Amino acid sequence: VPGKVTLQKDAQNLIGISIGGGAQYCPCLYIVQVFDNTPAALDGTVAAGDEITGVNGRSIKGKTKVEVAKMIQEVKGEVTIHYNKL
Amino acid sequence: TVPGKVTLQKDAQNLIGISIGGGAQYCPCLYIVQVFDNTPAALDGTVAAGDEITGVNGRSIKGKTKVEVAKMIQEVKGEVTIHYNKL
Ligand SMILES: O=C(O)[C@H](CC1CC1)NC(=O)C1(c2ccc(Br)cc2)CCN(Cc2ccccc2C(F)(F)F)CC1
Numbered sequence: 001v002p003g004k005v006t007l008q009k010d011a012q013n014l015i016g017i018s019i020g021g022g023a024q025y026c027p028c029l030y031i032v033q034v035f036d037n038t039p040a041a042l043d044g045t046v047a048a049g050d051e052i053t054g055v056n057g058r059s060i061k062g063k064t065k066v067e068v069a070k071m072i073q074e075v076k077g078e079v080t081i082h083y084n085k086l
Numbered sequence: 087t088v089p090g091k092v093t094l095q096k097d098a099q100n101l102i103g104i105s106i107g108g109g110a111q112y113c114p115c116l117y118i119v120q121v122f123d124n125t126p127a128a129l130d131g132t133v134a135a136g137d138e139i140t141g142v143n144g145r146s147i148k149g150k151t152k153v154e155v156a157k158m159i160q161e162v163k164g165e166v167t168i169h170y171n172k173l
């Protein structure tokens with residue numbers, strides 16, 4: 001089930017997630033942790049184990065975790081995360 | 087990638103306290119998604135959300151679906167060894 005959610009960045013330019021995946025032999029990218037009291041956590045749409053498929057209308061295919069973390073961090077104010085629900 | 091393994095004691099409900107992810111047509115890798123509170127896996131402390139699972143009791147999970155991996159884990163009674171790569 002695909003989905004998208006726009007999250008407002010906190011004062012430290014974070015949404016509040018950890019990610020995993022996007023390595024050799026393991027292409028897919030996932031939300032690993034959603035931290036308490038962050039935008040992601042308080043929105044409630046995303047959760048551990050949902051698959052990250054895009055950021056602000058662009059695919060994360062082929063990208064590494066550092067790469068995707070930068071794709072998110074570059075985007076100020078708010079960011080849309082495109083996902084598949086576990 | 088830091089490989090390891092851990093033998094966990096099954097609870098009275100034949101559980102270790104984990105849910106898992108991946109194991110899919112185009113995302114072949116399998117992961118631990120959640121470690122539930124007050125379970126063998128949570129009380130042991132070795133494994134955590136995001137660790138990749140590579141095998142169960144000396145056998146690989148390569149190519150299996152998550153329902154198959156859950157069945158593999160459930161069939162072993164008493165204790166089971168989870169081979170993993172650490173996040
Ligand atoms: O929350 C973001 O907007 C981003 C998003 C990117 C996609 C991970 N998260 C991060 O920058 C971090 C990260 C993780 C993996 C990689 Br690979 C890279 C970067 C994860 C979150 N922390 C801080 C953290 C630390 C401990 C508890 C809570 C928090 C906090 F987030 F502040 F709530 C900084 C690094």
Ligand SMILES: O=C(O)[C@H](CC1CC1)NC(=O)C1(c2ccc(Br)cc2)CCN(Cc2ccccc2C(F)(F)F)CC1
Nearest residue numbers: 100101102103104105106122123125152153155156159
């Ligand atoms: O803990 C296990 O030993 C196994 C291991 C298998 C590989 C997931 N886990 C499971 O049986 C479940 C499962 C998940 C995904 C698939 Br795909 C299939 C099965 C997850 C754990 N629950 C019970 C659960 C539910 C809610 C709160 C707590 C708990 C409890 F486990 F008691 F902590 C039963 C189903």
